[PDB]
Design a protein around this motif. Sequence first.
Motif, PDB file in Angstrom:
ATOM      1  N   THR A  30       0.812  -1.205   0.000  1.00  0.00           N
ATOM      2  CA  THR A  30       0.000   0.000   0.000  1.00  0.00           C
ATOM      3  C   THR A  30       0.851   1.263   0.000  1.00  0.00           C
ATOM      4  O   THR A  30       1.968   1.247  -0.511  1.00  0.00           O
ATOM      5  N   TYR A  33      -1.991   6.361   0.738  1.00  0.00           N
ATOM      6  CA  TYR A  33      -3.379   6.351   0.263  1.00  0.00           C
ATOM      7  C   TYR A  33      -4.259   5.531   1.200  1.00  0.00           C
ATOM      8  O   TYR A  33      -5.442   5.837   1.396  1.00  0.00           O
ATOM      9  N   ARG A  36      -6.022   7.688   3.818  1.00  0.00           N
ATOM     10  CA  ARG A  36      -6.637   8.941   3.355  1.00  0.00           C
ATOM     11  C   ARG A  36      -7.911   9.294   4.089  1.00  0.00           C
ATOM     12  O   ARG A  36      -8.232  10.482   4.182  1.00  0.00           O
ATOM     13  N   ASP A  52       5.287   7.634   1.831  1.00  0.00           N
ATOM     14  CA  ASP A  52       5.268   6.441   0.991  1.00  0.00           C
ATOM     15  C   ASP A  52       6.652   5.817   1.032  1.00  0.00           C
ATOM     16  O   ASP A  52       7.642   6.499   0.728  1.00  0.00           O
ATOM     17  N   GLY A  57       4.045   3.513  -3.630  1.00  0.00           N
ATOM     18  CA  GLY A  57       3.231   4.735  -3.743  1.00  0.00           C
ATOM     19  C   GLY A  57       3.825   5.669  -4.757  1.00  0.00           C
ATOM     20  O   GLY A  57       4.253   5.258  -5.861  1.00  0.00           O
ATOM     21  N   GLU A 172     -10.188   2.921  -6.861  1.00  0.00           N
ATOM     22  CA  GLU A 172      -9.319   2.575  -5.741  1.00  0.00           C
ATOM     23  C   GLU A 172      -8.293   1.526  -6.157  1.00  0.00           C
ATOM     24  O   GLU A 172      -7.104   1.672  -5.859  1.00  0.00           O
ATOM     25  N   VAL A 175      -5.663   3.177  -8.215  1.00  0.00           N
ATOM     26  CA  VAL A 175      -4.651   3.857  -7.404  1.00  0.00           C
ATOM     27  C   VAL A 175      -3.650   2.845  -6.860  1.00  0.00           C
ATOM     28  O   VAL A 175      -2.438   3.074  -6.886  1.00  0.00           O
ATOM     29  N   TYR A 176      -4.142   1.728  -6.331  1.00  0.00           N
ATOM     30  CA  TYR A 176      -3.218   0.797  -5.690  1.00  0.00           C
ATOM     31  C   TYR A 176      -2.264   0.173  -6.698  1.00  0.00           C
ATOM     32  O   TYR A 176      -1.136  -0.173  -6.330  1.00  0.00           O
TER      33      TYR A 176
END
Length: 283
Positions: A30, A33, A36, A52, A57, A172, A175-176
């Motif tokens: 991860t 994020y 968040r 990060d 990240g 989501e 993003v990951y």
Amino acid sequence: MKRVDVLDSAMSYIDVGQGDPIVFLHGNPTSSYLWRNVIPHLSDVGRCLAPDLIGMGASGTSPTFSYRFADHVRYLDAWFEAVGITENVVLVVHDWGSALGFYRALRYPEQIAGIAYMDALVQPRTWAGFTDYEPLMRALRTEQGERMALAENVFVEKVVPGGVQRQLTEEEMAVYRTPYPTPQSRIPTLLWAREIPVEGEPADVQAMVQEYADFLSRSDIPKLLIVAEPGAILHEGGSELDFARSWPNQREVKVAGRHFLQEDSPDAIGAAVRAFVLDVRER
């Protein structure tokens, strides 16, 4: 996000709010994020910092592909020193972020005002404690791991959604996935699986984790244990959660969640961490 050079790389980090530092440390696979929806419960009561880790990240990568736990200790140490986060720190930690936060507290306990932790590496692991993650994790630690983590990106594509009760949205997951577009960018996720100290190996990590486990089981640093139900690393009936519950000067709050409990109960986690931070600052 801000960014600061650290050793031979550069570490991006969230930095929001004023006052004494609250440092949020994520784990594998991860980034900041993951915090968040927790941080807004804290950014009016402290200075919330969430880096990060290198290779992860939005941060820079390691030019020498140095991604063992000890390398991340060194990179994150340089971050603490460059940003000046060495006094009255409340750590808020998860997964390998907890091993990093716990190891920081072991070496510089005079800097740490309190520790809030969740699904954490609180001592060296045994295979039984992996429960239904044992097959995957055993395989990642064999020669199968390059294919599973690098060619197939198993930590993002399977482990993250598997560790969330709700359905992650496509945004989501996007993003990951963003740090890991290629096999050669996924080396940190494989290293994190192989660095877990399990029944003595790797021995160098096992000694580091054992040392901080001995320390925290005798430390008067104030602690908040957030237990997820059913959780993952720390689960009811497990030997690791039982050891965690032995630590002094600790309170516990229960929330709903699996391994990535911040995706299921961020507001309850945030409320619990907020009350803890306010208590800590009162002293």
